[model samples]
Structure formats: structure tokens, C-alpha cells
Target: GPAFPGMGSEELRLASFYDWPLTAEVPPELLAAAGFFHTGHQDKVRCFFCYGGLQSWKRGDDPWTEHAKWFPGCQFLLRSKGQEYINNIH
Candidate 1:
């Protein structure tokens, strides 16, 4: 378990801040700030509230955009990023 308990899965819970992929260019702090944890599989990242995972990311890409694209139905996505905000993104 991490500072985030009951987050994603037991496997994903094992990932530490240091475990986040350096190549992903996504800061662990950023992910944690957005309630996300690493899945320790490939470059996958999952949202705590949504339990949705996404991979194949690149540099200069926004995490919010990717999150919304892959997990539009996420509660966190809907609460934080409304349909209007999401609509303008994609």
C-alpha cells in the first residue's frame, strides 16, 4: 500500500515514486497529485477514482488529455474535467 490506500489494484499499489518510468517523462508528483498510481507494467498509469489504465504515451503530451481520452467515464474526470472542458480538449 501507499499514501493512497484502496486506490487501484494490489499490483499497482506496489509501485513507488521511484518506479515511475523515467522515459514516460511524467513526474510521479504530477501523477500522485492527480490521484494516479503506476501499474508497474510497461508504461501504464491508472487513475485512483476511475481504475482506468492507459499506455503508449509520448513527451509533450498532456496527462489530462490522455486520461480523458482513455477514461472519459471516470468520476474524477467528470468531476474535475466537465463535459465542456473535455469537449474542447478532444
Candidate 2:
């Protein structure tokens, strides 16, 4: 169970990035796919299941990889990407 269970949908996550600061660097689609939604801050986003926050966008930064790098224990990430993918990043 997630703290913000209502934010579980990728569609909601995608919509939350309406005014994303780093739209040129990081696409909202990728963030949503990685289980993250904008926090209405400057490039900051939080995962729906883990509540893990990430920011400081850069070109070539894979959202899923960064998510795994920072929050390996996230259940949504583990289920979506699997344990092997998480281990590879570490």
C-alpha cells in the first residue's frame, strides 16, 4: 500500500507534470513510467508507492535507472523492473 494510493495511475502522474521545469531535459512520459509525479516544485518529483523524491534533471538520465539507483527497495520499482534490473544499477 502507498501513502498516496490515489496517485497510482501513470496518467495522473503524467498530468501532474503540466509545468515541469526540466521538460527539455526529462520528458514527463518517462517520469510517469518510472512511477513518479511532479511535486509542483522546481523539477522535483515523488514516487507514488515509495514516496521517494528526485530532482536535478540532466540529459541522458534514465528515469527508471535513477529511480532504482536511489530507491532500490521501492516495491513498485521492484515489481515493474524486477530485482535483476535493480541489482545491475547498483
Candidate 3:
């Protein structure tokens, strides 16, 4: 396999910056950020997510985490199939 040497990197990286849809309609901002603006939710493809479970971003200790604000971007998603990379959260 490519060991993340494939398009998987692109998939995982964009998930980092996008936000999960709080509504059942699926978030467009997320898809747009991934270069798929018009790709709305369709049956089995409802949503996607980033590394989650505490400090998913691991995006350099963001200010939210420092103040104990349990970021939505961090916690293991309840909206997707789950992490397939970097289990330490992002």
C-alpha cells in the first residue's frame, strides 16, 4: 500500500480544517474545504471527520484546549465512521 502515500492524506488533512454538520443536512463548509463544494450528503455518504477523541487537532495546542473547552474538532466524532489515521487525535 502507499501508507498514506495515496489520496488518503488529502482526505485526512481537509477533515482537520472543516467542521461537522450540527444539523442532519450535512455541512457544506466541510465539503467545500475539501474541494467538493457541491457534494452534499447522499445516503451512505452522510459525513466525514478528522482524528478525534480529546485532542484531535493536536494542531499545536490550540487556545480552546488550553482553557479546557473540549473542542468539537477534537472529540472522537459521533458523526462519521471514525478515525483511520493518527489515533493520538489529529
Top of the candidates by lDDT: 2
What order do you get sorting by lDDT, best first?
2, 1, 3
Give per-candidate clash totals.
0, 0, 1
Per-residue C-alpha lDDT of model 1 across residues 1-90, encoded as one tens digit per residue: 233347644344434455566535776655655557777746777777877776776766677777777777676777777898777766
Worst 10 residues of 3 by lDDT: 43-52
Most accurate candidate by TM-score: 2
Q: For candidate 2, lDDT tens digit of each residue in 1-90?
A: 986898999999999999888887888999999999999768889999999998787886889999999999999999999999999999
lDDT of 2 at 18: 92
- What TM-score would every model get versus the actual structure? 0.69, 0.95, 0.18
Ranking by TM-score: 2, 1, 3
- Model 2, stretches more than 4 Å misplaced? none
Cα error, candidate 2, residue 1 (Å): 0.8
Instruction: Output the worst ten-in-a-row residue range by lDDT, candidate 1.
Output: 8-17
